[PDB]
């Protein structure tokens, strides 16, 4: 009954190599290990995904091209192809599949891959810094065993890659809370977004405005997850916990702290379903480690010391060197009416789910 923790020196080094989040993976692992949390988990070395495994989602054309350039397809602007990007992609994909396979094998009820959760990538297109959609690959693998999977995406951005991947099916319900605002990436996921054809009503979207804080975010999340659990009754959960919601992120939109996300996490954990935990966004690296370390503590039912332990990256935690994050002084633009209207739509949509 012990959480699986996907890790290996090689996997972390590979993930540390992303130019936009250099060494984020080491900071996150280091802090966790500094709090000694790895000792209470089952460390599992990730396997690298095969072409056939990655092909469960991505097109052969896309994958063959990625490997080519690693030595079009959205591979520019936000998603430039660098050397070794294909080995990177395969590492993350295989790590999330390893997480899934553990859950299938009854090895654990919770399997953590903090450097996965790249939720924007499409079957044949990179997008939003995501080159391979390991979240989708995790779900497809779980799908070999579970008849109904719930995907919950708490990243700041709409989980469009995963939603699109399953928009026509009722076997995986996707739930995304996210900033929805003009010109804001990726532009999709209004509350009227409910999925298509046979997947109609099995996509759930909660559009949210700048400045939202812990209490309001949890009220929203809990009321939605309540309804979703009731109507859909999942057999397994995949949870993306992007940390770009946390106060002080370069994405500068929400005003969350890890305690708030933490409460959402606890709510999901009490369902006692096989749960696959993923990271994702998080562009303030020290804050992202703070968040994901605290959340590992939540997973472990542990209360962590507020003093940041001495470790490799201790100096990145100044000027206060504590675990807690203070909300900023920014306005909360979520009007209580709009929110209630949103919940009501969702409530109505879900009644169609049986």
């Amino acid at each position: 009954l012990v959480p699986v923790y996907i890790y290996s020196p090689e996997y972390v080094s590979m993930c540390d190599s992303l130019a936009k989040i250099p060494k984020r993976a080491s900071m996150v692992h280091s802090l966790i290990e500094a709090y000694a949390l790895h000792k209470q988990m089952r460390i599992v070395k990730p396997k690298v995904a095969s072409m056939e495994e990655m092909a469960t989602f991505h097109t052969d054309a896309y994958l063959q091209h990625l490997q080519k350039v690693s030595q079009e397809y959205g591979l520019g602007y936000d998603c430039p192809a660098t050397e070794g990007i294909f080995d990177y992609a395969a590492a993350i994909g295989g790590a999330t599949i390893t997480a899934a396979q553990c859950l299938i094998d009854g090895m654990c009820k919770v399997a953590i891959n903090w450097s996965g959760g790249w939720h924007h990538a499409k079957k044949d297109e990179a997008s939003g810094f995501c080159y391979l959609n390991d979240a989708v690959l995790g779900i497809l693998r779980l799908r070999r065993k579970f008849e109904r999977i719930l995907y919950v995406d708490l990243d700041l951005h709409h989980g469009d890659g995963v939603e699109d991947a399953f928009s026509f099916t009722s076997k995986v319900m996707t739930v995304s809370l996210h900033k929805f605002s003009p010109g804001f990436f990726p532009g999709t996921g209004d509350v009227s977004d409910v999925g298509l054809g046979k997947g109609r009503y099995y996509s759930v979207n909660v559009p949210i405005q700048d400045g939202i804080q812990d209490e309001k975010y949890y009220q929203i999340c809990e009321s939605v997850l309540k309804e979703v659990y009731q109507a859909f009754n999942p057999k397994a959960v995949v949870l993306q916990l992007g940390a770009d919601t946390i106060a002080g992120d370069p994405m500068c939109s929400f005003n969350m702290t890890p305690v708030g996300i933490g409460k959402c996490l606890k709510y999901i954990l009490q369902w006692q379903l096989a749960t696959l935990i993923l990271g994702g966004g998080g562009y303030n690296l020290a804050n992202t480690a703070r968040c994901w370390t605290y959340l590992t503590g939540v997973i472990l039912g542990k209360t962590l010391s507020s003093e940041i332990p001495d470790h490799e990256f201790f100096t990145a935690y100044g000027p206060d060197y504590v675990l807690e994050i203070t909300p900023s002084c920014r306005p909360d633009r979520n009007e209580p009416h709009r929110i209630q209207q949103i919940l009501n739509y969702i409530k109505g949509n879900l009644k169609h789910v049986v």
């Binding site: 602007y77 936000d78 997008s127 939003g128 810094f129 951005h157 990436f185 990726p186 532009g187």
Partner: peptide
């Protein structure tokens, strides 16, 4: 993030 964001 579509752009360098």
């Amino acid at each position: 993030x579509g752009c360098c964001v």
